């Protein structure tokens, strides 16, 4: 089935052996609509962990503020005249570095949002609706 939203994130799908790192490149489709800010939290299924959140958003060429205690990230995405940016088609909006422990069983482990995925339209609190797809990390095939 399908969920429609104004903005859809694509976590993509990955493979790993136990002991690997997995670089998760989160893509975004806003139907070419501009975005003023994001404020999000991430998770991955145990026993995998998110070991680092990249401090750059390539889709917006902007610095990402990060917090590893809560696995949170946020940024503003304005041009030099203070207007919202259209994300760059093809470019990662977030990059996550995931650890797959040496003893991870074969299986499918998902990466995604942890209950916060705010995508702002302007400076007044208004938000786009958001949905997510993919995010499977398949360990051991």
TrEMBL record:
Coiled coil: none
Top-level taxonomic group: Bacteria
Compartments where located: Secreted
Protein name: Putative cellulosomal scaffoldin protein
Underlying gene: scaB
Stretch of the intact protein here: 399 to 539 of 2071
